[PDB]
Amino acid sequence: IESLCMNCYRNGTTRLLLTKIPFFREIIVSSFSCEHCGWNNTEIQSAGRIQDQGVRYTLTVRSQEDMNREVVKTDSATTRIPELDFEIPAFSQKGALTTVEGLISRAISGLEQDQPTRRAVEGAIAERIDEFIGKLKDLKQMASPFTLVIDDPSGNSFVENPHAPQKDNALVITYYDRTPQQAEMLGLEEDLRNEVLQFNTNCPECNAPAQTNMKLVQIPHFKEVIIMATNCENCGHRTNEVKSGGAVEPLGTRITLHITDPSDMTRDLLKSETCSVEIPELEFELGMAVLGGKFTTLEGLLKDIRELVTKNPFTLGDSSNPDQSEKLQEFSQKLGQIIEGKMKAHFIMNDPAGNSYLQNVYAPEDDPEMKVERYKRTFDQNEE
Ligand SMILES: [Zn+2]
Ligand SMILES: [Zn+2]
C-alpha cells in the first residue's frame, strides 16, 4: 500500500497487520515506513465487524462519473436496480471491491457467458435472458438515469462520493436498526481464557532446579488439570502425571466412543497416566501409563499407537519371528482402516481417577455416539 510520507512527502509503504479478537472485533496495526527519509510511524485501531446500524445506499446514476464510483459490497448486501426489476440477493456473491459499472458488467457476464449452451438446449428461456441482458447493456449508454440500491444490514458496504468533501445529492444514504431476522442472518464482551500456561519447576524428588515441566490446563468443557512431565538430568527420575486442580474429588470415568465418521479423528483428547485405552474390535488394550499425559487428538493417539505397536515388534516368551506376526499385521491393517475412516470401531478410555478427556463435538448437547459412565474405584489390586 502506497501512502504519503508525512516527514518528506514522498510515497512510502504501509503494512496492515490484522488480528481477530473475540466478539466481532478486529485490531488493525498500520505500520508506515519511508525508505527515502527513514521515517516510520504506527497506528493501532480497533474495529467492530458489524456496524451499529444497517445501511442503504440509493444512488441515482446519471453520468460516467457515477459509473466510475468505487463500490465495496459485503456478502450480506442486497443489490437492486428497480427500473429493470433486477436483484442480486444477499449471499449470491462473495464480498468484493468494484465499481458501479463493474457491478453491471459482472451481472451481464453472469447471464451472458452460458447463453451459447442455453440457446442450444433451452431456446425460449434463453430468449428472455438475451432480452434482459440487452436492458442491462442499455444502461451503459445513459440516455435515462437509473437507480442502484445497495442495502446491507451489516453496515459495511460502501459507495464512493466522487465529489470529494463536497455534497453528494445523487446518493441518498439511510441507516436503520436491524430486525431480529437481519441480526440472525449475520450470526448475532471478553474471552480471557488461558487454556494453557506452562513453566519449569523443581524435581519432585530431588529438588533439582527446572527439571519438571508443569502445564496448567483450563479449557471450558473440562475441569482444570495440571500436567506434570519430569525428565531429571541430575537424578534420572522420569514421570508423566495429570492431576485434578479443582475441589471435585474425581470419580472413575469410562468413556466409550463409537467411531463413525472421519471427523471423529480431530476430536481433542487428554489421556492421563491412569487411563486405559481399549479398541474391542481389534482386541487391543493399552497400558494405563502409556502414550499419555499428552493433550492430543484421536488421530494423534491412534497414529502413536500404530507406531508403538506395529513399528516396535518383539517376541517375549516364544521362539516366533517378531517380524512375521499374523496378529500384529492384522492389527496394523485394521488400525489403518479406522484411521482412514473406512472401518467403524469403539474407542474406550477408562480412568479410575477421572483425569482424562475426550472432546464431545456436540457439547453442551449429548453426543449420540459417545457414552460417559462414572464409577467409584474402591479397590487397587497393587495395594491401596
Ligand atoms: Zn519520507
Ligand atoms: Zn530429579
From Swiss-Prot:
A Gene Ontology BP annotation from the UniProt entry: mRNA processing
Keyword Zinc: yes
GO CC annotations on file: axon; Cajal body; cytoplasm; Gemini of Cajal bodies; growth cone; neuronal cell body; nucleolus; nucleoplasm
Keywords: Cell projection, Cytoplasm, Developmental protein, Differentiation, Metal-binding, mRNA processing, mRNA splicing, Nucleus, Repeat, Zinc, Zinc-finger
Annotated knockout phenotype: Die during early embryonic development. Embryos show growth delay, failed to form normal trophectoderm and to expand the inner cell mass.
Organism domain of life: Eukaryota
GO molecular function: protein folding chaperone; receptor tyrosine kinase binding; translation initiation factor binding; zinc ion binding
Induction: Up-regulated by high fat diet.
Keyword Chloroplast attached: no
Zinc finger map (C4-type): 5-37, 203-235
Tissue specificity statement from the Swiss-Prot or TrEMBL entry: Expressed in brain. Expressed in the spinal cord motor neurons (at protein level). Expressed in spleen, liver, muscle, kidney and testis. Expressed in the frontal cortex, cornus ammonis, dentate gyrus of the hippocampus and in Purkinje cells of the cerebellum.
Compartment list: Nucleus; Cytoplasm; Nucleus, Nucleolus; Cytoplasm, Perinuclear region
Family per record: Belongs to the ZPR1 family.
Its job: Acts as a signaling molecule that communicates proliferative growth signals from the cytoplasm to the nucleus. It is involved in the positive regulation of cell cycle progression. Plays a role for the localization and accumulation of the survival motor neuron protein SMN1 in sub-nuclear bodies, including gems and Cajal bodies. Induces neuron differentiation and stimulates axonal growth and formation of growth cone in spinal cord motor neurons. Plays a role in the splicing of cellular pre-mRNAs. May be involved in H(2)O(2)-induced neuronal cell death.
Subunit organization: Component of an import snRNP complex composed of KPNB1, SNUPN, SMN1 and ZNF259. Interacts (via C-terminal region) with SMN1 (via C-terminal region); the interaction occurs after treatment with serum. Interacts with elongation factor 1-alpha EEF1A1; the interaction occurs in a epidermal growth factor (EGF)-dependent manner. Interacts (via zinc fingers) with EGFR (via C-terminal cytoplasmic kinase domain); the interaction is negatively regulated in response to epidermal growth factor (EGF) stimulation and EGFR kinase activity. May also bind to the PDGFR receptor.
Disease: May contribute to the severity of spinal muscular atrophy by increasing spinal motor neurons degeneration.
Protein name: Zinc finger protein ZPR1
Organism, as annotated: Mus musculus
